[PDB]
Amino acid sequence: GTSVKPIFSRDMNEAKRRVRELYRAWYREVPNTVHLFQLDISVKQGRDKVREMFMKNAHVTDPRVVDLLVIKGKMELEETINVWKQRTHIMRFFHETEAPRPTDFLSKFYVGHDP
Amino acid sequence: MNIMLTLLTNVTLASLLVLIAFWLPQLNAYSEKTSPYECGFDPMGSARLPFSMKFFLVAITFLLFDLEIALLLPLPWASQTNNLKTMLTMALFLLILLAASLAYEWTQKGLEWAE
Amino acid sequence: TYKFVNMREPSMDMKSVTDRAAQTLLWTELVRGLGMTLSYLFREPATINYPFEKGPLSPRFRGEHALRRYPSGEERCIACKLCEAVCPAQAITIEAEPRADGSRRTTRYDIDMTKCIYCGFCQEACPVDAIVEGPNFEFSTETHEELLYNKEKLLNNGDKWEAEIAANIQADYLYR
Amino acid sequence: RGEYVVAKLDDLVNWARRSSLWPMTFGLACCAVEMMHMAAPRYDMDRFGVVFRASPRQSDVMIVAGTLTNKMAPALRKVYDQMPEPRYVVSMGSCANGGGYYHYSYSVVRGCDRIVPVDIYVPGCPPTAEALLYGILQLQRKIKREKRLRIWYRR
Amino acid sequence: PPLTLEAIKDRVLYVLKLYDKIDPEKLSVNSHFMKDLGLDSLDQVEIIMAMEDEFGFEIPDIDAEKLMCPQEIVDYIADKKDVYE
Ligand code: SF4
Ligand code: SF4
Ligand code: SF4
């Protein structure tokens, strides 16, 4: 039809409200994650990572996409809180082993054919 | 005193077996090697897991039964008295009281490992 | 039709109740279990003295792969790639070209034995009985790399095991 | 010279270590049942001193019997780390060797040797209990030829 | 005794100038977090936490978004804890 049914939010403000609640929960969880998993990172580093994960999806305008992103974020938060994830899973947001990939045209031209 | 020499020898040889056992092998230890074993993951400390009133109640009931057993141990010499009817009456009295303690614990829930 | 497995009520007379009380207090079924274990202690064990004795197999047994030849010494593989097409694990890699004498022969024939599932589909697909699964099953290696077989490796396997491979095939080809 | 005594001591310790190879039951998939068939009376791995062991703290060899998935690899590496030394890893079956039937899957690690160092690669899908027993005896012969004390004497 | 209005204002001030993106010199009584201090609503959500750990109670989403100027936080805290100087 012309319109569609919502997941939870009937509007963008409702989606923003749930996004803010999820962001709050993640921000408070970060110190407990750092302590419990015995991560070698700082709480500032973990909270900046949470913010940067949230900022990846800032361009989303569809309230249903925002709702599904919130659902997946709450799922990830519950995997982190219940210690279903291991330390390796928490540390996968930080691609510490992957080398810094090139970004400018010249270095990409030097190393291969990929655009 | 022979018994003291025997105890000294037993303790000394056990400690010597410790010393060979706990110093002779070649070692190479890292952090993840000596991590507490939890079937492939990390254990949760939680907060004072060893609880439940039943573990304490069995200890207390064993203590009281052990006290009555302490009262029963002189029995082999007690049968060497001329006044055997009094001694038999008192020994059977103590055993009826042991049986009564067991029965009272039994009937009033007591010995049960409840929900 | 069906049957009940636990639909028997115990008898409630003097003799049966006393039977069950004696079973309770004298541990008679525990004694039956002890008797069964004691009877097994005096039975000849089913253990075989490996490696001096070996487990019994059949001519159909699917073990290590091999590439075979004609009695002339010419290879059987004519690089049709049917085995590579049918391989469920994509364990077979083949490259071919005309040989200097004009023959249609492989220049690459690899089997990733760590990709292989040892299903025997390759020897079914083969129209000339070139690729087979041989009888060998004791070829464990100390490194991962020795299990990535070459055309030379598979041909040497064929030359190594052809004497018994051919006997197995003669034993079972009338079923194929 | 004094290298004869060191060689004899190495021989003694390596005979004692291969005569009591206590493995850890890492049964992930179909390869687990052929390994308990090598356990069964017909092959009787206990007759070689190879006992049915328990928690990695008393295990000398890890047998990776089955597919290792991405979800499962951290646990395998954890228990490998928790093994006291000397410790060995036997990769049993195509899945543990190099991925096998599931080599091209999104959720399967292609060979346990990406996670742990592997001493023996037992091929087959599954390897027969006799093939696994051959791998175990081959591991025993690997231990027989170690020269740890002779390496130390020439340091 | 119930902390008075300035006893709320100074706490808000301190926890606001602890925040990195907020400059102390640009921070005033009515320095609206978004347009004046150049913040996001995630930054506002973050500072609202810093108003929860100090003042004790919990500010819910329905009205925590309404707290834009540093004076508005002061008024909300005064209202919530029955504070009338
Ligand atoms: S036995 Fe099966 S998996 Fe192995 S190479 Fe042949 S077709 Fe492929
Ligand atoms: S081995 Fe057989 S099936 Fe495979 S390419 Fe050669 S002829 Fe064809
Ligand atoms: S190698 Fe074959 S038998 Fe062993 S676990 Fe993998 S699929 Fe199963």
Residues with Cβ < 8 Å from B94, sequence gap 6 or more?
B68, B71, B72
Give yes or no for a cis peptide into C51 (omega within 30° of 0).
Answer: yes
CA of D67 vs chain A CAs: smallest distance (Å): 20
Chains interfacing with C (3 or more CB pairs < 8 Å): D
Place of tokens 């034995």: C113
Which region holds residue C13: left if phi is over 0, alpha if psi is between -120 and 50, else beta?
Answer: beta
Residue D49 per-residue DSSP state: T
Rounded CA-CA distance A8/A16 in Å is: 12
Residue E12, helix vs strand vs coil: helix
Buried b (16+ CB within 10 A) or exposed e, A24-52: bebbebbeebbebbebebeeeebbebbbe
How many angstroms separate the CA atoms of D37 and D128, rounded? Answer: 9
- The nearest CA of chain A is from the CA of D71 a distance in Å of 10
**Chain-chain contact of B37 with D57 (C-beta, under 8 angstroms):** yes
**CA C149 – CA C108 distance, rounded (Å):** 11
Look up residue E66 and give its DSSP letter: T
D63 min Cα distance to partner chain B (Å): 15
Helix (H, G, I), strand (E, B) or coil at D44: coil
Stretch 3-22 of chain A: residues touching chain E, C-beta under 8 Å: 16-17, 20-21
Experimental method: cryo-EM
Separation of alpha carbons C84 and C92, rounded Å: 5
Return the closest-CA partner of residue C83 out of C113, C114, C128, C115: C128
Residues in CB range of C109: below 8 A, 6 or more apart: C67, C77, C92, C93, C94, C150, C151, C154
Other Cβ atoms less than 10 A from the Cβ of C50: the count is 20
Spatial CB neighbours of C1, under 8 Å, sequence gap ≥ 6: none
Name the residue type at position E45: V
D133 vs C contacts (CB less than 8 Å): 50
Distance CA B93, CA D144 (A): 70
Between the alpha carbon of residue D1 and those of residues C169, D11, D150, D153, D155, the distances in Å are 58, 16, 12, 11, 16
Distance between CA atoms of residues C123 and C134, nearest Å: 10
Measuring CA to CA, which residue among B58, B52, B56 is closest to residue B105? Answer: B58
How far CA B15 is from CA of B9, B12, B18, B19, B22, in Å, comes to 10, 5, 5, 6, 10
Q: Does E52 touch chain A (CB under 8 A)?
A: no
Sign of CA dihedral E20, E23, E24, E28: negative
C-alpha of residue E7 to centroid of ligand 2, in Å: 89
D132, D122 contact by CB (below 8 A): yes
Maximum separation of any 2 CA atoms in chain C, in Å:
98
Q: Are D149 and D7 a contacting pair, CB within 8 Å?
A: yes
CB contact under 8 A, D121 and C143: yes
At C87, list the tokens.
């391989």
Question: Which of D33, D76, D90, D95, when mutated, tests ligand 3's pocket best, judged by the most ligand atoms within 8 Å of its CB?
Answer: D95
Closest residue in D to C142 (Cα–Cα) = D120
Given a contact cutoff of 8 angstroms between Cβ atoms, the answer to whether D122 and C137 are in contact is: no
Span from the CA of D132 to the centroid of ligand 2 (angstroms) = 30
Q: Alpha carbon of D61 to those of A91, D93, D95, E55: distances in Å?
A: 29, 16, 19, 58
Residue A107 to residues A96, A97, A100, A114, D105, Cα–Cα distance (Å): 21, 20, 12, 11, 32
Across the strands, what pairs with C97? C105
- Among protein residues, the one with the nearest Cα to ligand 2's atom 6 is C77
Helix, strand, coil percent values for chain E (each to nearest 5): 50, 0, 50
Task: For chain E, give the longest Cα–Cα distance.
Answer: 37
Task: Spell out the residues 6+ positions from residue E72 whose beta carbon is closer than 8 angstroms to its own.
Answer: E66
Query: Are the C-beta atoms of D108 and D99 separated by less than 8 Å?
Result: yes
Distance of CA C6 to the CA centre of its chain: 40
Q: D27: which DSSP letter? A: E
Continuous segment of H or E residues that includes residue D10: helix D2-18
Question: How many angstroms separate the CA atoms of C113 and C118, rounded?
Answer: 8
Q: Is C92 in the pocket of ligand 1 (CB under 6 A)?
A: yes
Atom of ligand 1 nearest to the CA of C62: 1
Q: How far is the CA of D136 from the centre of ligand 1 (A)?
A: 25
The β-bridge relationship of strands C131-133 and D61-65 is: unpaired
CA E29 – CA E6 distance, rounded (Å): 11
For residue D53, what is the DSSP state? Answer: -
| Four-way CATH pick for B1-108: 3.40.640.10, 2.40.50.100, 1.20.58.1610, 3.30.470.20 | 1.20.58.1610
D31 is in an annotated binding site: yes
| Ligand 2 mutation pick, C69, C78, C169, max ligand atoms within 8 A of CB | C78
State whether residue B36 sits within 8 Å of chain A by CB.
Answer: no
Residue having the nearest C-alpha atom to atom 7 of ligand 2: C77
Element (H, E) at D23: strand D23-27
The residue written with tokens 């100390």 in the block is: C142
D79 inside 8 A of chain B by CB? yes
* Spatial distance between the Cα atoms of E73 and E51, rounded to a whole number of angstroms: 8
| Separation between Cα atoms, residue E81 and residue E4, nearest integer Å | 11
Residues with Cβ within 8 Å of D55's Cβ and at least 6 positions away in sequence, in order, are B37
Which helix (H) or strand (E) segment holds residue A72: the answer is helix A63-81
d(CA C91, CA C83): 10
Instruction: State how far the Cα of C27 lies from the Cα of C21, in Å rounded to an integer.
Output: 10
D74 touches chain A (CB under 8 A): yes
Nearest of D122, D129, D123, D131 to residue D62 by alpha carbon:
D122
Q: Alpha carbon of E65 to those of A17, A49, A79, E76: distances in Å?
A: 9, 23, 28, 12
Helix (H) or strand (E) holding A50: helix A43-56
Chain D: list its partners (3+ Cβ pairs within 8 Å).
A, B, C
Compute the distance between CA of residue D83 and CA of residue B91 in angstroms, rounded to an integer.
57
Residue E40 falls in the annotated catalytic set: yes
SS3 label, residue B94: helix
Beta bridge partners of C96: C106
Cα–Cα distance for residue pair D25/B31, rounded to 1 Å: 24
Q: How far is C107 from B14, CA to CA, in rounded Å?
A: 69
Is D111 in contact with D97 (CB distance < 8 Å)? yes
CB atoms within 10 A of CB D139: 25
Q: Residue D89 has which token pair?
A: 């890893």
DSSP B27: -
Give how far Cα D59 sits from Cα of A51, D52, D91, D155, Å: 45, 10, 16, 29
Answer yes or no: are the C-beta atoms of B25 and D148 closer than 8 Å: no
Q: Give backbone dihedrals phi and psi of A101, rounded to 5 degrees, phi first.
A: -70, 150
Handedness of CA C16, C22, C28, C29 (dihedral sign): positive
Put simply, the answer to whether C88 touches D124 (Cβ < 8 Å) is no
DSSP for chain C, please give it. Answer: ----SS--PPP-SHHHHHHHHHHHHHTHHHHHHHHHHHHHHTS------TTTS-----TT---SEEE-B-TTS-BS-----HHHHH-TT--EEEEEEE-TTS-EEEEEEEEETTT-----HHHHH-SSS-EEE-S-----BSSSGGGEE-HHHHHHHHHHHHHHHHHHHHHHGGG-
Which tokens in the block code for residue D114? Answer: 């990406």
Question: What six digits make up the tokens of E26?
Answer: 């640009």
Cis peptide before C45 (omega within 30 of 0): no
Q: Can you spell out the DSSP letters for D61-127?
A: EEEEESPPBTTTHHHHHHHHHHSPSS-EEEEESHHHHH-GGGTT-TTB-S-GGGTS--SEEE-SSSP
Total residues belonging to chain D:
155
Give the residue extent of every domain in chain B.
1-108
Q: Which amino acid is at A104?
A: D
CA pair distance C103, C81, nearest whole angstrom: 15
Could you tell me if B44 lies within 8 Å of chain A, comparing CB atoms? yes
Residue B38 forms beta bridges with which residues? B41
Q: Is the CB of D29 under 6 A from ligand 3?
A: yes
- Using only C-alpha atoms, chain D has a radius of gyration, in whole angstroms, of 16
D95 lines ligand 3 (CB under 6 A): yes
Using CA atoms, how far residue D51 sits from D21, D38, D61, in Å, is 7, 12, 11
Ordered DSSP codes for C78-98: ----HHHHH-TT--EEEEEEE
In this structure, what token pair is assigned to residue B60? 């207390």
H-type alpha helices, chain B? 2-21, 53-72, 75-78, 84-107
Q: Which of E40, E43, E53, E82 is catalytic?
A: E40
Interface of E with A in 14-33 (CB under 8 A): none
- Ligand 3 atom with the smallest distance to the CA of D93 is 1
Angstrom CA distances, C119 to A78, C133, C140, C171, stand at: 43, 9, 18, 20
Candidates C104, C60, C109; CA nearest to C83 is C109
Give, in degrees to the nearest 5, the angle at Cα A104 between A103 and A105: 125
What token pair was written down for A10? 């009937």
Radius of gyration of chain E, Cα coordinates, nearest whole angstrom: 12
Q: Could you tell me the distance, in angstroms and rounded to a whole number, from the CA of residue C131 to the centre of ligand 2?
A: 6
Whole-angstrom CA distances from A105 to A100, B82, E4 are 15, 113, 61
User: Which residues does E33 contact at the CB level (< 8 Å), separation at least 6?
Assistant: E22, E39, E43, E44, E47, E68, E69
Q: Is D131 in the pocket of ligand 3 (CB under 6 A)?
A: no
Put simply, whether E36 touches A (Cβ < 8 Å) is: no
**End-to-end C-alpha distance for chain E, whole angstroms:** 10
Q: Which amino acid is it at D57?
A: R
Residues in chain A, total: 115
Element holding D25 (H helix, E strand):
strand D23-27
